[PDB]
Design a protein around this ligand. Structure first.
Ligand SMILES: [Zn+2]
Ligand SMILES: [Zn+2]
Length: 60
């Protein structure tokens, strides 16, 4: 993408064309790898309307 130095996730690394998901409390994006979510899992959650939270927000 046009902002290769833009950081995401708990790891503060770029997108790098990796699968990412969005926390519905903080609205940041997270690499699936870093938060333990595969593409199939994330797609299933999106289909079911599961309000997935990142590791910081899930404790709130
Ligand atoms: Zn990450
Ligand atoms: Zn969050």
């Amino acid at each position: 993408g046009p902002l290769p130095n833009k950081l995401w996730c708990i790891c503060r690394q770029p997108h790098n064309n990796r699968f990412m998901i969005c926390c519905d409390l903080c609205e940041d994006w997270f690499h699936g790898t870093c938060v333990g979510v595969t593409k199939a899992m994330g797609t299933d959650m999106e289909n079911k309307g599961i309000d997935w939270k990142c590791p910081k927000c899930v404790k709130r």
